[PDB]
Amino acid sequence: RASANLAATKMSECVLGQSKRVDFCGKGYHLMSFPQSAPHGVVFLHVTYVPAQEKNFTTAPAICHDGKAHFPREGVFVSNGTHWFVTQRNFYEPQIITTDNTFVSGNCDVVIGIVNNTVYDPLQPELDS
């Protein structure tokens, strides 16, 4: 009965939805689950997302631009050695640092590990032309 309650919970939270519980439905970031009837039991085919190929990058908590601290709206600041990019956490998709993906939260004196870089303003080129 405990096993069947667990099976019902897994059906509800992984077949009927996507569960954020870690290692509840498969090892990895759970995507789906498919029930399969079995003799006196049930089999779940837990479809999970597993990152594969890592790559080292230099990172900073914030970006000091124009005398103010810029933090990533969603992602992390990474550098390939010379240029700084903002990248989503779970997949390497470098993006140019702009004001759309970053938010200002003060000055640079207080953040530990902040680095000096430029933040592109998507309004200045239109203002010039």
For other proteins, the closer of residues 93 and 122 by Cβ is 93
To other proteins, the closest distance from the beta carbon of 58 in angstroms equals: 6
* Integer Cα distance of 120 and 99 in angstroms: 7
In the structure encoding, which two tokens stand for residue 126, read together? 């239109």
Q: Which amino acid is at 82?
A: T
- Return residues touching ligand NAG (CB under 6 A): 53-56, 64, 80-83, 113, 116
Interacting positions 101-120 with other proteins (CB under 8 A): 103, 105-106, 110-113
Cβ neighbours of residue 117 under 8 Å, at least 6 residues apart? Answer: 63, 64, 65, 84, 97
Among 67, 82, 91, 126, binds other proteins (CB under 8 A): 91
In the structure encoding, which two tokens stand for residue 54, read together? 């890592």
**Closest alpha carbon to 124 in 99, 105, 103:** 99
**Residue 98 touches other proteins, criterion: CB under 8 A:** no
Among 23, 74, 109, 128, binds a second copy (CB under 8 A): 23
In the structure encoding, which two tokens stand for residue 94, read together? 């470098």
**Residue 83 touches a second copy, criterion: CB under 8 A:** no
Choose from ligand NAG, other proteins, a second copy, none: what does 21 bind? Cβ within 5-8 Å by kind.
a second copy
To ligand NAG, the closest distance from the beta carbon of 56 in angstroms equals: 4
* Integer Cα distance of 97 and 121 in angstroms: 9
Site pattern 34..63 for other proteins (x: CB under 8 A): xxxxxxxxxxxxxxxxxxxxxxxxxxxxx-
In the structure encoding, which two tokens stand for residue 52, read together? 């594969």
